[PDB]
Each structure stands twice: as structure tokens, then as C-alpha cells.
């Protein structure tokens, strides 16, 4: 693990030194190919989820269930895992406030 992490840091610093390995011409080529394909398909870009989305509660319930599924109870869960379980229960309890938080983060959070 330690050796792999050292190697990964080497990789990141080499990237920052050697800049993008993909040249501008390659980037524009792939970009133009993608836009041509999407235009051909007649694809409509996904919109930012509206305030009153019909299924937002359904999606939140599915997400919380998926998060809960990752706990095959061994009776010994660490602090962070138990805290996440508490947060999941809180979101289950009050769906709308969690949705407001989620949309706020998706709009502003970048760090």
C-alpha cells in the first residue's frame, strides 16, 4: 500500500510537470466526434433537477436504501460508519430538508 501510494504521487507530479498528454488537436477531434454523435442521436441535455421534481423523493429513498445496504451488521461499527448511519436515518426522517441541502451543495460546493 505504501509503495503504491508513493508511485501514485510520482504519477500525479509527473502529470503536473508534463501537462496534459492529450494534445489540443486530439481533444478537439474527440470533442467534435462526441457533439456530432449527440446531435445525430438528437439528445436533450439533462437539466438541473427542478425544485418540485415528481420523483425526487423516490430517488432519495433509493439512495438511502443503497447506502444502508452496505452495513452487514457485525455489531462493531466505527465512529464514522455509525455517524453515516445516523445521517441516513435523519434523511429518511425528513426527506425535504436533505433535498434542499443536496441541491445547495450541487449548486455551490466546490471544495
Amino acid at each position: 500500500t505504501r509503495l503504491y501510494l508513493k508511485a501514485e504521487q510520482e504519477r500525479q507530479h509527473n502529470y503536473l510537470k508534463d501537462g496534459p498528454y492529450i494534445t489540443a488537436e486530439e481533444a478537439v477531434a474527440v470533442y467534435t466526434t462526441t457533439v456530432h454523435w449527440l446531435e445525430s442521436r438528437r439528445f436533450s441535455p439533462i437539466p438541473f433537477p427542478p425544485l418540485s421534481y415528481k420523483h425526487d423523493t423516490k430517488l432519495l429513498i433509493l439512495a438511502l436504501e443503497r447506502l444502508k445496504e452496505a452495513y452487514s451488521v457485525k455489531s462493531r461499527l466505527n465512529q464514522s460508519q455509525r455517524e453515516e448511519l445516523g445521517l441516513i436515518e435523519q434523511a429518511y426522517d425528513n426527506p425535504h430538508e436533505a433535498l434542499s441541502r443536496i441541491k445547495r451543495h450541487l449548486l455551490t460546493q466546490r471544495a
Binding site: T32, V35, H36, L38, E39, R42, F43, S44, P45
Partner: protein
């Protein structure tokens, strides 16, 4: 040995119990389903469940002995007959001259037929309430009734 041999497929759990629950729910909700689509403001019959078959046989007898009159006439005659034979206070010898006279004086045979109809016919404060908190509603996560419910583009310039 093949591979599938000795493999078996189970059977629905509590099939009969779920069927019984469905039957009870349907016989209880029969009134609701009967009166579901009857838009009473747009329905003229709403004003006018095994008592309904008795009402129907009463209506059939009245239709036979009255001559195929509108539904309002039939319902009024049925209400008259049932209510009067129920409010006679078990006074029977007087029923001929009235009911059979109304129906056309068919015969005492139909008199003994129609007595069976009257035989088979049959805003609060409420202060003070009790409550019970229980952890009920435990099931197998399957349908409560064993039923299958069902219900600009991109561009480059």
C-alpha cells in the same frame, strides 16, 4: 446424473390465507366499488349486499304483477310494499285487501309468495375516546392482496 434433476420450485407462501384476506377485503369494499364511478349529480338512479338480491326479486315480482313500468315506479312500489309489510306489526289478515288489491288481486298463492318478501326483507360529539398503540402491520413484504398492481437538442453551427 444430469444437473437439473432433483431441483424443485417452491409454492407461494400463505396462498390460501392471502386469498381469504383478498376475499374479505373485496366483500367489504364491494360497496365502495359499486358506488365508485356513480357520479350522482350526473346519475339519476343514485337517489332512487345480499339484501340487494332480495330487493331484486321483489322488483321482479312487482314487474310481473304491475306491467313493466319505469324504474322509478318499480322502486317506489318496492319501497311501499316492503315498508308497509314491515310496519304492519305482524298484522297479516289485513294485508290481502290492501297489497293484493294494489297488485291486481292475483291470488292467495301469490299472497303466500309475497309474504316471503316481507319475511326476507330483514352529528354526535361522542366525547371520550380510547387509543391503542401497537406494533402491528407486519407482513412478508409482498402485496397485501395477492394481485399484480400496475400503474431543445444539441446542434453545431
Amino acid at each position: 446424473t444430469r444437473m437439473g434433476d432433483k431441483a424443485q420450485r417452491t409454492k407461494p407462501q400463505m396462498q390460501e390465507e392471502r386469498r381469504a384476506k383478498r376475499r374479505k377485503r373485496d366483500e367489504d369494499r364491494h360497496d365502495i366499488n359499486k358506488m365508485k364511478g356513480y357520479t350522482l349529480l350526473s346519475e339519476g338512479i343514485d337517489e332512487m349486499k345480499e339484501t340487494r338480491e332480495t330487493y331484486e326479486v321483489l322488483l321482479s315480482f312487482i314487474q310481473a304483477a304491475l306491467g313493466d313500468q319505469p324504474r322509478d315506479i318499480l322502486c317506489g312500489a318496492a319501497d311501499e310494499v316492503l315498508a308497509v309489510l314491515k310496519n304492519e306489526k305482524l298484522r297479516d289478515k289485513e294485508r290481502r285487501k290492501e297489497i293484493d288489491l294494489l297488485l291486481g288481486q292475483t291470488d292467495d298463492t301469490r299472497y303466500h309468495v309475497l309474504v316471503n318478501l316481507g319475511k326476507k326483507i330483514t352529528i354526535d360529539e361522542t366525547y371520550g375516546v380510547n387509543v391503542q398503540f401497537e406494533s402491528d402491520e407486519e407482513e412478508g413484504d409482498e402485496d397485501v392482496y395477492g394481485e399484480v398492481r400496475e400503474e431543445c437538442t444539441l446542434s453545431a453551427n
